[PDB]
Each structure stands twice: as C-alpha cells, then as structure tokens.
Amino acid sequence: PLVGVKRVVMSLLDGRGPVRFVLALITFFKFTALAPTKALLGRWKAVEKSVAMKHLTSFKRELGTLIDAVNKR
Amino acid sequence: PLVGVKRVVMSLLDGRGPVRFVLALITFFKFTALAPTKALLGRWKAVEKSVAMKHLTSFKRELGTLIDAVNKR
C-alpha cells in the first residue's frame, strides 16, 4: 500500500487531512484548471472565510519568495 | 486501476506530465512544507529558468483572483 507523500496526497483527494493542506491542493487545481474531486470540494466549501484568507495570503508571500529564487538561478 | 485526476496526480509524483503541471505541484509542496518525490524534483531541476518564471508569475495572478473570490463570499 501507498506510503510517504503519495499516501498524504491520495488522502487529500479523498477529503482527509489538515485544512491548510486542503487549501494548498485547491490552489494546485486552480493553477492547472484540472477538476477537483467531490470530497476535496466538500472540504473547501466548509472552510471558514477568515481561516481561508489567512492561509491563502501566506501562500502568496511564499510564491513570491519562490519566484525570487528562480530569478536568481 | 486509477483514472481521472488521481491518475494525473500519481503520474506527476512519478515525474511524468506537462511542465506547467510539474511547476504547479512543486508550489503545492512549498505551501505545505511536505517532501517532494525524487522524480518530481528531477523534473523541477531540469526546467529552463525563463519557462519557470512565466508559469510561476501566472500562478501568482491566479492566486490573487482566488483570494478576491474568497474575500467576497
């Protein structure tokens, strides 16, 4: 059976795991235009607006950092 | 056997698929602080700097729009 991150990601696609990880995997689907699973969308809709804002704005700062690192390769 | 997005994501964790999708899933690992697979890191190291800059800056604009939609719930 699956172990490590592959197990973690499979579980997220079945609706299980931390709220921050749900929100992150939703951003992946937004960037790719792929179809999220029903269980993941279920988790996403139930997240409190204030909780969603906090994690997503933190993702944007981290994406900025990543872009700076790439620019300096 | 796996079908739909689960098959797409499994293949990406084995290093297979479009460069935009590799870059997207790398951002998922950055946001979560989870460990990427060796096969995924291999694809990421091989991406041309200009190609990486283009997709990652487009992700940042899409994340902004997503934050806007959450603010307006």
Q: Where are the domains of chain A?
A: 1-73
CATH 1.10.287.10 fits B1-73, yes or no: no
C-alpha B9/C-alpha B12 separation (Å) is: 5
* Residue listed under structure tokens 């700097």: B49
Q: Give B 6-65 residues with CB within 8 A of chain A.
A: 6, 8-10, 13, 20-21, 24-25, 27-32, 34-37, 49, 52-53, 56-57, 59-60, 62-64
Q: Which two tokens stand for residue A56?
A: 């997503």
Which structural technique was applied?
X-ray
Q: Report the amino acid identity of residue A16.
A: R
Question: Pick from A13, A38, A41, A44: which is nearest to B6 by CA?
Answer: A13
A2 lies within 8 A of chain B by CB: no
> Which token pair is A57?
């704005």
Task: Select from A15, A13, A73, A70 the least CA-distant residue to B23.
Answer: A70
Output b/e per residue, A37-62; b: 16+ Cβ within 10 A. beebeebbeebeeeebeebbeebbee
How far apart, in whole angstroms, are the C-alpha atoms of residue A32 and residue B62? 10
| Resolution value, angstrom units | 2.0
Phi, psi of A37 (to 5 degrees): -70, 160
In 3-state terms chain B splits into helix, strand, coil percentages (rounded to 5) of 75, 0, 25
